Every structure is written in structure tokens, then in C-alpha cells.
Amino acid sequence: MDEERLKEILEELERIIEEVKRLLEKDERLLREFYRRDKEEFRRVIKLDEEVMKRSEELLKRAEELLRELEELIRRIPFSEEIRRELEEILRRLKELYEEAKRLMEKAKELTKRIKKIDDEKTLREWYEIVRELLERAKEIIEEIERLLRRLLEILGLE
Ligand SMILES: CN(CCO)c1ccc2cc(/C=C(\C#N)c3ccc(C#N)cc3)sc2c1
């Protein structure tokens, strides 16, 4: 197909990662506000967190589908050996990062499930410590995905 489909896919992937970043920052803010302060207030922050997780998992499945589409079109386009190898290296790194994000979201879901089973400051602290590190790793993954998508637009000459 054309290079315009390549651009449209890369742009939709960019919009997804930007929405994912917004959602992660909202969840970080609500978790910080709770800890900087109540039992029903925790039920509240946990419910809003679980909603961010749902949206984030939907956006990931959408991004993985668009990546498969990008890989297929790049395969169909008769690129030079050098450009193909460059594009393929980047696509493999992106597949690794999307896999890392899925595993991180699984850990976050398990952690939320475990905390819902408890009444306690020490427990809430240990839990906030794990959540901070996961959110920080998530931010790192999103930033690298954003950079790699820009590299692709650049290697293709679409930026
Ligand atoms: C530690 N916590 C708190 C749990 O109570 C959370 C909560 C929500 C959450 C959501 C996460 C999402 C991503 C990551 N990473 C992600 C999504 C889409 C794409 C793409 N395209 C790429 C990445 S990570 C994460 C962590």
C-alpha cells in the first residue's frame, strides 16, 4: 500500500501513547492526593485506578493491532536492504516494549487485587512504593515508544 497509510498508522499510535501518558499522570495524581491526606476514600481511588487500567489495556490492544498492520505494510513495500534492517530493528524493539507494558499492567492489576483484600499504614506504604516504581517504569516505556515512533517517521521521511 501507500506511504500515506504508513503515516496514518504511526500518527494513530502516537495519539494512543499520548492518551496513555495522560491517564497515567491522572492516576499518579489521585494516588499522591490520597497518600498526602479514610476507608471509602481508598475504595474511591482504587475504583478510578481500575478504570484507568481498563482504558490503558484497551489502548494497548489497539496499538498492538496497528503495529501488526505497520509490520505488514513495511513488508509489502520494496525498501532497500539498509532501510529495511533499520525499520525492522525498531519494530522488534517496539514489540518488546509493548510486551513489557502488558506484563507491567498484569503486575499492577495483581497488586490492586491484593490491596483490596486488606484493611494499616505500613501495608499502604509498601503498596505505594511498588506502585511508584511501576508507574515510573511505565513512563520510561511510553517515552521510549514515543522516541522510536518518531525515529520511524524520520527514517521513512514522513516527518
Ligand atoms: C502501577 N499502577 C498503579 C496500579 O494500582 C499502574 C496503573 C495503570 C497503568 C497503566 C499502564 C499502561 C501502560 C504501561 N506501562 C501502557 C499502555 C498502552 C501502551 C501503548 N500503546 C503502552 C503502555 S502501566 C500502569 C500502572
Side-chain angles (χ1 to χ4, degrees), residues 1-33 35-37 39-41 43 45-53 56-81 83-124 126-159:
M1 237 191 296
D2 276 279
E3 220 146 336
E4 183 65 13
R5 194 60 51 86
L6 272 198
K7 203 166 161 263
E8 221 61 44
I9 292 162
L10 281 165
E11 291 177 330
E12 299 157 324
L13 276 164
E14 288 181 315
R15 288 197 280 273
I16 292 162
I17 213 55
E18 291 160 17
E19 187 45 54
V20 169
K21 184 130 94 162
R22 260 161 247 135
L23 292 158
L24 275 66
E25 286 154 347
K26 182 164 168 285
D27 202 35
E28 199 167 86
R29 253 182 271 112
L30 62 94
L31 284 183
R32 198 187 313 126
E33 184 191 59
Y35 201 88
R36 95 178 83 160
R37 283 191 257 246
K39 279 229 237 172
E40 280 284 281
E41 225 42 65
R43 286 233 314 170
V45 305
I46 279 282
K47 289 248 214 122
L48 301 172
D49 184 1
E50 288 180 309
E51 183 178 2
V52 167
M53 184 57 73
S56 300
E57 208 88 44
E58 293 177 350
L59 288 159
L60 176 70
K61 299 194 202 190
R62 284 175 55 185
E64 300 173 295
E65 173 52 48
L66 282 150
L67 187 56
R68 301 187 199 99
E69 292 181 31
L70 195 70
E71 305 179 76
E72 301 162 23
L73 181 37
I74 290 176
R75 279 188 193 115
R76 290 179 231 125
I77 291 141
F79 287 111
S80 78
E81 306 100 288
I83 296 296
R84 186 177 291 302
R85 301 202 182 280
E86 299 171 47
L87 298 168
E88 286 177 345
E89 180 246 327
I90 299 184
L91 295 165
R92 282 181 238 115
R93 187 44 177 164
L94 286 166
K95 210 219 300 152
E96 301 182 346
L97 290 169
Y98 286 127
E99 296 168 311
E100 303 184 24
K102 183 169 71 172
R103 292 195 281 261
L104 194 166
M105 269 181 297
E106 304 165 342
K107 293 179 179 179
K109 289 195 303 207
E110 309 164 333
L111 180 73
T112 303
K113 293 179 179 179
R114 299 181 183 124
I115 202 64
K116 270 154 84 209
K117 307 165 159 332
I118 303 285
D119 195 304
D120 191 281
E121 265 200 88
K122 170 183 214 126
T123 199
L124 262 290
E126 292 166 318
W127 158 88
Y128 193 37
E129 191 178 308
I130 299 136
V131 310
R132 293 203 305 278
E133 191 276 325
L134 297 177
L135 286 177
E136 166 63 31
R137 186 46 193 165
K139 288 199 258 188
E140 301 171 6
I141 283 150
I142 294 169
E143 298 162 16
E144 188 173 356
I145 286 166
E146 291 186 313
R147 285 201 304 279
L148 282 163
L149 290 175
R150 271 196 298 272
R151 185 182 295 276
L152 281 174
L153 281 170
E154 297 167 334
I155 299 182
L156 293 173
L158 287 175
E159 187 135 76

